[PDB]
Amino acid sequence: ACDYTCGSNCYSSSDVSTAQAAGYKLHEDGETVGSNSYPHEFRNWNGFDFSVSSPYYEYPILSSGDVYSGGSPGADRVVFNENNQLAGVITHTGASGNNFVECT
């Protein structure tokens, strides 16, 4: 099985690291990309029990394996914190409204 499965997208740990790394660089630099300004704070309204400290930040992870650069973000997000630690991988797919479910 894939390291991470979001909806029908299969992601490896390196895929996640790659998206995480792109998101983190933008974060430490105070910059963003896309009409929705990624990365931005992940509010965790769904109450996921992450083991790393908050605040959390979400950055899109794309089904093409490409690093997000401002297009349509799709449903998948990697969540990380200012210590550059991976909090988790989440997706809108399978959820209702603006809610999220953790990828499996």
Curated annotation (Swiss-Prot):
Record keywords: Disulfide bond, Endonuclease, Hydrolase, Lyase, Nuclease, Signal
Tagged with keyword Hydrolase: yes
Annotated EC: 4.6.1.24
UniProt KW Signal keyword: yes
Disulfide cysteine pairs (residue numbers): C2-C10, C6-C103
Single GO MF descriptor: lyase activity
Reactions that this protein is recorded to catalyse: [RNA] containing guanosine + H2O = an [RNA fragment]-3'-guanosine-3'-phosphate + a 5'-hydroxy-ribonucleotide-3'-[RNA fragment]
Source organism superkingdom: Eukaryota
Active site (UniProt): E58 (proton acceptor), H92 (proton donor)
GO cellular component term of the entry, any: hyphal tip
Family listed: Belongs to the ribonuclease N1/T1 family.
Assembly notes: Monomer.
Protein name in the entry: Guanyl-specific ribonuclease T1
